[PDB]
Amino acid sequence: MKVRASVKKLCRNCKIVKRDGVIRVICSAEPKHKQRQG
Amino acid sequence: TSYIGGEGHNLQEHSVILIRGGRVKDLPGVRYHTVRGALDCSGVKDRKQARSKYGVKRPKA
Amino acid sequence: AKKVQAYVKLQVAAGMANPSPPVGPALGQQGVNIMEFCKAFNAKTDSIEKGLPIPVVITVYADRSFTFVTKTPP
Amino acid sequence: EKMGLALGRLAKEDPSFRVWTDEESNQTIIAGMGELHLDIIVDRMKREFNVEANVGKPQVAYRETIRQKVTDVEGKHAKQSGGRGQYGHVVIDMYPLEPGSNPKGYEFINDIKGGVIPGEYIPAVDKGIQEQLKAGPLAGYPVVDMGIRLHFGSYHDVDSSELAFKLAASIAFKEGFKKAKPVLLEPIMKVEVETPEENTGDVIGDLSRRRGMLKGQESEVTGVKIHAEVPLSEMFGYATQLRSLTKGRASYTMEFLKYDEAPSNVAQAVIE
Amino acid sequence: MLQPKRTKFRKMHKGRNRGLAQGTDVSFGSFGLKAVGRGRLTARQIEAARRAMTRAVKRQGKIWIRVFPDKPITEKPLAVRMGKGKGNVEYWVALIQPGKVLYEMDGVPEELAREAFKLAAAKLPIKTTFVTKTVM
RNA sequence: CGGCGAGUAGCGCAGCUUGGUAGCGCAACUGGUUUGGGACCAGUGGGUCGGAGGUUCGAAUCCUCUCUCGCCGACCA
RNA sequence: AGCCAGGAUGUUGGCUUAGAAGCAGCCAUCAUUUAAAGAAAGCGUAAUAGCUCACUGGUCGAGUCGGCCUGCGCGGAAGA
DSSP, X not given: OBOXXXXXXXXXXXXEEOGGGOOEEEESSOGXXXXXXX | XXXXXXXXXXOOSXXXXXXXXXXXXXXXXXXXXXXXXXXXXXXXXXXOTTTTTTTOOOOOO | OOXXXXXXXXXXXXXSSSOHHHHTTXXXXXXXXXXXXXXXXXXXXXXXXXXXXXXXXXXXXXXXXXXXXXXXXX | OHHHHHHHHHHHHSTTOEXXXXXXXXXXXXXXXXXXXXXXXXXXXXXXXXXXXXXXXXXXXXXXXXOSOXXXXXXXXXXXXXXXXXXXXXXXXXXXXXXXXXXXXXXXXXXXXXXXXXXXXXXXXXXXXXXXXXXXXXXXXXXXXXXXXXXXXXXXXTTOOHHHHHHHHHHHHHHHHHTTOOEEEXXXXXXXXXXXXXXXXXXXXXXXXXXXXXXXXXXXXXXXXXXXXXXXXXGTTHHHHHHHHHTTOOXXXXXXXXXXXXXXXXXXXXXX | OOOOSSOSOSOOOOOOOOXXXXXXXXXXXXXXXXXXXXXXXXXXXXXXXXXXXXXXXXTOSEEEEOOOOOOEEEEOOTTOOSOSXXXXXXXXXXXXXXXXXXXXXXXXXXXXXXXXXXXXXXXXSSOEEEEEOOOO
């Protein structure tokens, strides 16, 4: 999964989540967007 | 080696062909005339005259 | 007045009989193979001008019959 | 030796299996029908006759053609140095003929106003090029499309000999060839494909991978008649990479069309 | 790339950089790329990050560097014992004093404008921002 | 990675110290001579000096900065 | 914002005629019915179809939205 140092939505169906203080991004229509570590 | 008496052949590096004797008196060493129309050689065409040699089968006409 | 049943909004070729090439398969994804295309269409086209771009709504029904919602050169 | 016939025994016993010959590369063709068809042939040879062979890949022709003009670049030669020298001056203009109608690849006519090349030599000087053309320098493979117009020339009475004119021409060609900066051509095959109805989106997508392009396709009862232009190079064993997609329901036919451009990366696989 | 043509000296003293900018604001066009940092822009970056801008302004508009290197840099080769003369002019830079407008641009509107500089600023070491030409 | 010393017509070599003109000879070429070729005898073309930039009235030239390539040694633990 | 219904017509809107149907891409970026609906923000397509949002009306029932400048914080951050 993308562990980009600078996460951001690659779509609209992407979302911004604040789990554990860690910044995680979850997409339901394209798993590729899945990324944390922002 | 061996000489291919004919007006255009197709023999090349394979398919064993029958070989018979006979010097050519034209090429030092070339002392065997190839067997044309035999084992793996298709004999010449364009010929009817003296077709007993050159493996040219009988003309239909 | 319907939605996509088996029907199409394609080919303008009336007079160049048997309009196979450019459009035949453009609607042949669902099977409008060239044969059935113009026999009933031309039997209806016999009222107006050929040699012109006559658009046609190919309304092939669920029972393989069809009457048209065709148009004139848009 | 014992091999080729060893298959002919099994090349008649199976009427679907054939054995051609790579004329232009002097080799052999195993004409099978799939992974298995090819497999057992190897092993049938392997143990039944105890004769091992290595599977390989087919060959191509790689013919060339020029893409620009040449100005006039000459080819004079004089091997006098005592005796009966070899003299002949040839200054010529070779051009990029189209790959169109006319049968043979090159084209040749004369342009010597004053007949400064006397008679006999023309066909004579030519023949060396008639010979020269069985192979091209750029690769080591034949060439086509020579629009050669013979500009001028010059010789000597009893020294300028045909050998020189066969010779001197060649040099004019080599220099002439470099000044027209040719490039390879590879076999482009006209190929059709029948695709169920649904795996078409994969077959068409497939050809794009293999450099082919969308040049006509129509739908039928349970298939489609697809057409594209693709070099035979990118056709090694299509069926395998083909069947795997359409549940092996497709059916294709391969007919040669014409040679065409060999691209950059493709152009240097010519390495040897 | 940008390089001074036939200047007067091969080598220049280091020289500090303390001081605010004086090539203040939007002179030529409508938008600009104003820098907030303080850093030795090298000749390489200016160009490399310029074509890195023109791609997004396809063919419409007008792009303008407001900078020019005119500053050699003297870097010694490997394994060279300190001293033994002064170095070699390896490349050129253009000092930046905070406040300097780098890339004025005009033509295309605000939106695409915000973009060209967005991409461009990425390939430059100094933190920068956006500016607009105001009345006076 | 420095360091002296060349680089000059297709080719190999003068002219360079001291700044004012580009040569030695072969090659290609032209004709003469022989039935013809080899050789030979008289003539022509053929570089503007590796390149940039300066200083000079004038730069092949005297230099600086780049380059091109030969030889010298790149060390003592 | 949800929850609801619509999101249509001429129009496949040209070309490169390779297929490009709002959606490869270049140009235009019109007008109808118009409460409004872009000759179009996105997923889809061999190419259509399909599935949404733009924008507009039902119920609902209280504030809410979007940029900008600073404070203090999170990540980026792995060595014997």
